[PDB]
Amino acid sequence: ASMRILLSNDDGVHAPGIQTLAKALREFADVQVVAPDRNRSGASNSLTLESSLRTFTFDNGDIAVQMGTPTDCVYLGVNALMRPRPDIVVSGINAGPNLGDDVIYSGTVAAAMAGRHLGFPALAVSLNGYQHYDTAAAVTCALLRGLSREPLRTGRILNVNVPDLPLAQVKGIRVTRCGSRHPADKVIPQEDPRGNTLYWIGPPGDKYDAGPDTDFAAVDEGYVSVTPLHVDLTAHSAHDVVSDWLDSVGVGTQW
Amino acid sequence: HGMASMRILLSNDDGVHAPGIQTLAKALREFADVQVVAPDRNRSGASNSLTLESSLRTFTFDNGDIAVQMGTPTDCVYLGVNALMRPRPDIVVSGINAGPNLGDDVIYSGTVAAAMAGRHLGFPALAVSLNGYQHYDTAAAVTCALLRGLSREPLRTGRILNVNVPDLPLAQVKGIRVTRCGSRHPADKVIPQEDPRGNTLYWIGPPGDKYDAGPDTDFAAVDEGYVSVTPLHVDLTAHSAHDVVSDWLDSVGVGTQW
Ligand SMILES: [Mg+2]
Ligand SMILES: [Mg+2]
């Protein structure tokens, strides 16, 4: 009768986002934290395959995985560290948005995606700023109460982006689709003291597809954005064009 | 016709030293202008990860190959396209990977991620994976064929092609199928291993069993000795769930007062 939540993030176990959320969730749910030991923004859906992973348990039960990715954390949490397995994965609250085509790089999104085969759809929660963690926590709690009110029948992952506003100013929720950007192109070089050039990944590309039905627009307008995600990367609409193309260029056929 | 008619950024996730990338490099160099930009070590499992908290250093080998030190496959393509290469590449080719990248494994794949990073270029990017370790020459011939195809006629729709090659002599490959990604059961094994001081450390276990591996899937194509070609995109939206999620929110009163 009580929800059992595996809580992770990509900011790391000590981040205000995850700690604020953990506090809110523990009011009405059982919560196990399994999270990276440090900041893994940009970890996307990476997994540690070449080495075994070391865990550390804090006094309050929180588990940190040393050099663990967000996916590593959920993998260990679901398969080894929680008995019995969790009802759900919640990942967040992230410091900063996970919108549009940025989502494939997101560690926060990835931890949620790793929980896609559990009893409840996974939640990835990101704040569009750094101030109103309480607002994002309230939205998450509402969603979780929601999921115990009626089953959500389709969608294994919800990507939630919350405006960085006091709760009273959040206008509502929009169900959205992922927008997109032009390709990022600006690298930031910086010389080391020996005059060798090192390279920083620069800013994202300008918004391309950010119209009224997108996650970008919803957040800009002061709404919580909720996008259902899946892991199928197939571009189904391209099927026939590719097939005809192959025949036309004679690849895979003699004639 | 043409020893260097196409400019290729060649990357992988196994790293610059991998036989799969070196075999492919030799094959591509017969007709293309090839620049290798790849990880300095095996980054299998790197998915679409990228380095944000630190700057990246490059290392150039004697043959002109570039490794990005501690670089992920996405780092390599991002840097290769945006800073390192002149002229810029016409296309990204990622591979040949030692091992399959099929079904829902693709989102965790460093090989696929490199190709995905080149999706905005003149030609659609290729990720190329061999279903095993032996017949790199087979995967190379298949890759060369696709590239020659792209120079004969441009591909209209589809920005990334995920190519899986059966580990067979070329003569035994039956043909080519355009496929969709299948999917697996979740991996569920954790392999514990005590360190010298008695601490338990954990290894990620093997992939789950195939779940969706029917006749239209990448899994089935490879299993019956065909090259699988799946067009991929980066849009993670489950568009078919939109109405269900909307109706659901309303029915549970989340986001509305009533
Ligand atoms: Mg983060
Ligand atoms: Mg690999």
Chain B contact for A162 (CB, 8 A cutoff) = no
- Chain B residues closer than 8 Å to A75 by CB: 187, 190, 204
Whole-angstrom distance, CA of residue B69 vs CA of residue A53: 22
Per DSSP, A214 falls in state B
**Burial environment of residue B188 by CB neighbours within 10 A (0 to 12, 13 to 18, 19 or more):** middle
SS3 A139: helix
Gap from B150 CA to chain A (nearest CA, Å):
8
Whether residue B127 contacts residue B114, with contact meaning beta carbons closer than 8 Å, is answered with yes
The reply to whether residue A52 touches residue B82, judged by beta carbons under 8 angstroms, is no
CATH of the domain at B179: 3.40.1210.10
Cα angle, residue B103 at apex, residues A119 and A115 outer, rounded to 5°: 25
At what angle are helices B136-152 and B19-28 packed, to 10 degrees?
40
Phi–psi pair at B94, nearest 5 degrees: -120, 120
What's the rounded Cα separation, in Å, for the pair B198 and B171? 52
Burial label, B151 (beta-carbon count in 10 A; 0-12, 13-18, 19+): middle
Q: How far apart are CA A144 and CA A198, in angstroms?
A: 45
Interface subset of A 88-147, CB within 8 angstroms of B:
101, 103-105, 109-110, 113, 116-117, 142-143, 145-147
Judged by a CB distance cut-off of 8 A, whether residue B235 touches chain A is: yes
Angle in degrees, CA B87, B92, B95, rounded to 5: 135
Cα–Cα distance between B24 and B130 in angstroms, integer? Answer: 11
Cα nearest neighbour of B57 on chain A: A198
Per the CB < 8 A criterion, the answer to whether B204 and A49 are in contact is yes
Task: Give the pairing of strands A122-128 and A157-163.
Answer: parallel
Calpha distance A70→A126 (Å, rounded)? 14
User: Does B97 carry a binding-site annotation?
Assistant: yes
Measured distance CA(B136)–CA(B20) in Å, rounded: 6
Whether the link from the prior residue into A93 is cis, omega within 30° of 0, is: yes
Within 13 Å of residue B146, how many CA atoms lie on the same side as its CB?
33
CA–centroid distance, residue B239 to ligand 1 (Å): 25
3-class SS of residue A132: coil
- The residue of chain B nearest to residue A173, with distances taken between CA atoms, is B255
Enclosing domain of residue A77: 1-255
Peptide bond into B96 cis (omega under 30): yes
Chain pair A-B, CB pairs under 8 angstroms:
266
Residues 44-63 of A with CB under 8 A from B: 44-50, 52-55
β-partners of residue B202 are A53, B192
Compute the distance between CA of residue B112 and CA of residue B121 in angstroms, rounded to an integer.
15
Q: Contact at 8 Å (CB) between B228 and B218?
A: yes
Peptide bond preceding A84: is omega within 30 degrees of 0, i.e. cis? Answer: yes
Residue positions forming the annotated binding site of A:
10-11, 41, 94
Say which experimental method was used. X-ray
Segment (H or E) for A220: helix A215-220
SS3 sequence of chain B: CCCCCCEEEEECCCCCCCHHHHHHHHHHCCCCEEEEEEECCCCCCCCCCCCCCCCEEEEECCCCCEEEECCCHHHHHHHHHHHHCCCCCCEEEEEEEECCCCHHHHHHCHHHHHHHHCCCCCCCEEEEEECCCCCHHHHHHHHHHHHHHHHHCCCCCCCEEEEEECCCCHHHCCEEEECECCEECCCCCEEEEECCCCCEEEEECCCCCEEECCCCEHHHHHHCCEEEEEEECCCCECHHHHHHHHHHHHHHCCCCCC
Give the CA count within 13 Å in the CB-facing half-sphere of A132.
Answer: 19
Mapping DSSP to helix (H, G, I), strand (E, B) and coil, where does residue A239 land? helix
Q: Does B66 touch chain A (CB under 8 A)?
A: no
Reduced to 3 states (helix: H, G, I; strand: E, B; else coil), residue A146 is: helix
Entry field: residues in chain A: 255
Q: H-helix or E-strand containing A145?
A: helix A133-149
Pairing of strands B226-232, B57-60: unpaired
Rounded Cα distance, B29 and B107, in Å:
29
Q: How far is the CA of B169 from the centre of ligand 1 (A)?
A: 46
Structural tokens at position B240:
């078919």
Nearest-by-Cβ selection for A52 from B203, B248, B256? B203
Q: Which helix (H) or strand (E) holds A174?
A: strand A173-175
- Give the position of tokens 């348990």: A57
Burial level of A226, CB count in 10 A (0-12/13-18/19+)? buried
Distance CA A99, CA A176 (A): 10
| Closest-approaching ligand to the CA atom of A38 | 1
Chain B residue with the nearest C-alpha to that of A100: B235
The resolution, in angstroms to one decimal, equals 2.0
For ligand 2, a single-atom ion, the residues with CB < 5 A are B 13-14, 44, 97
Domain count, chain B: 1
Centre of ligand 2 from the C-alpha of residue B240, in Å: 32
Which residues, 6+ apart, have CB-to-CB distance to B146 below 8 Å? A251, B126, B161, B163
**CA distance linking residue B108 with residue A70, whole number of Å:** 12
Of the candidates A47, A78, A226, which has its C-beta nearest B245's C-beta?
A: A226
Contact residues on chain B for A172, CB-CB shorter than 8 A? 255-256
| CB atoms near residue A16 (< 10 Å) | 13
Question: H/E element holding A64?
Answer: strand A63-66
